[PDB]
């Protein structure tokens, strides 16, 4: 036995990877804010040693605390909020190049949106503030804390 | 695949106006900017504006400002050229190219670390005036 | 405003560069592009960001940023080389996509 990847309690740690990334211009579930997405991200759980494809995961059975994440259905399409506590820490994989999220100059946290189509393709989004990185496609390497729930 | 059909080869007279245009496929119409590039033969390669094809936002280059508007067909993803006042300098190749990356410009509003290139692009018009 | 040779000229398999330079409001702030152009053809991208190749273009090709100037590298020529390369870049002050005077690559 051990904790599925659709498991999240507040304090645990994730790491994103995003292969081939496009910089979007105004995300429409971060307050039409840019943001690097990823059609084939993974998604890792660091303290119990569990990945998977972010397009391969139930989105609508993934729980934080116990609860279900919370999702927006901006346009017709649903985003769900995994919250994090502190900034959304991203940068290029394999190269020390850090890029920084929107609220760089905030005590706001940042949080992890996933578009969902109900089958299998999702997005991973992570806000950004420009194209630090690049106009896209760059492999991303995101880390962050998860957050408490939003209520 | 994605590809940017222009029209045919132009040719007019001195002081008329031109319209260029370019259909789009393969992609979603309303989400990059068509951006356009004039070349005069013998002479190398120069941006002359953009278009955001979902509000109408474009933005010229500091030299055709005046004598240019560029239009949009979002029911038939067709992107409009219009260049009037024809001088003599404007026999030139004009080129139909989508851009990736930030699409906001002011003077001072972000000077730095700002990626944009043009992905795809057309196959040329060759607009001839005399 | 990024000038560029006017030529440039190698071996039929020998590697040569193409180097830009601009200001710091041209390159030591933003990232630099790299366009190819057959005579004849329209022009295609060669290199995206600073050292960042599309899917299609051969790994002979490379380029690096480095100050205010940028570079375009080649690891063997071949005949269908012949073109000219252009540079792109973000200007902040002038136009957010400015150009090169361009580089016809010969042969020696």
């Known amino acids: 036995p051990a904790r599925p990847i659709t498991n999240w309690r507040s304090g645990d740690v994730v790491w994103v990877t995003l292969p081939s990334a496009e910089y979007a211009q105004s995300q429409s579930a971060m307050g039409s804010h840019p943001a690097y997405w990823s059609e084939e991200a993974t998604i890792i759980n660091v303290a119990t040693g569990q990945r998977a494809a972010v397009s391969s995961i139930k989105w609508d059975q993934v729980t934080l605390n116990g609860k279900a994440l919370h999702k927006e259905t901006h346009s017709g399409l649903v985003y769900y909020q995994l919250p994090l506590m502190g900034k959304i820490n991203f940068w290029q994989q394999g190269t020390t190049k850090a890029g920084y999220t929107y609220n760089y100059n905030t005590t706001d946290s940042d949080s992890l949106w996933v578009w969902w189509d109900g089958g299998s393709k999702a997005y991973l989004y992570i806000s950004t503030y420009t194209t630090m990185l690049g106009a896209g496609p760059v492999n991303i390497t995101g880390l962050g804390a998860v957050g408490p729930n939003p209520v | 695949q994605v590809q940017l059909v222009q029209s045919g080869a132009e040719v007019k007279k001195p002081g008329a106006s031109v319209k260029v245009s370019c259909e789009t496929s393969?992609?979603?119409?309303?989400?990059?900017?068509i951006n356009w590039v004039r070349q005069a033969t013998g002479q190398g390669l120069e941006w002359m504006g953009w278009?955001?094809?979902?509000?109408?936002?474009?933005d010229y280059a500091q030299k055709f400002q005046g004598r240019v508007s560029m239009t949009r067909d979002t029911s038939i993803s067709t992107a409009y050229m219009e260049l009037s006042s024809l001088r003599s300098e404007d026999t030139a190749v004009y080129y139909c190219?989508?851009?990736?990356?930030?699409?906001?410009?002011?003077?001072?509003?972000?000077?730095?670390?700002?990626?944009?290139?043009?992905?795809?692009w057309g196959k040329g018009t060759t607009v001839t005036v005399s | 405003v990024l000038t560029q040779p006017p030529s440039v000229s190698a071996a039929p398999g020998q590697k040569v560069t193409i180097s830009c330079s601009g200001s710091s409001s041209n390159i030591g702030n933003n990232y630099v592009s790299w366009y190819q152009q057959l005579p004849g053809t329209a022009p295609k991208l060669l290199i995206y960001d600073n050292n960042k190749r599309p899917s299609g273009i051969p790994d002979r090709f490379s380029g690096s940023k480095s100050g205010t100037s940028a570079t375009l590298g080649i690891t063997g020529l071949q005949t269908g080389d012949e073109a000219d390369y252009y540079c792109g870049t973000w200007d902040s002050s002038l136009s957010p996509v400015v150009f090169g005077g361009g580089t016809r690559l010969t042969v020696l």
């Open positions: 278009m955001n094809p979902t509000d109408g936002n474009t």
């Open positions: 393969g992609y979603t119409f309303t989400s990059y900017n």
């Open positions: 190219a989508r851009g990736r990356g930030t699409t906001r410009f002011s003077l001072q509003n972000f000077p730095f670390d700002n990626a944009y290139y043009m992905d795809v």
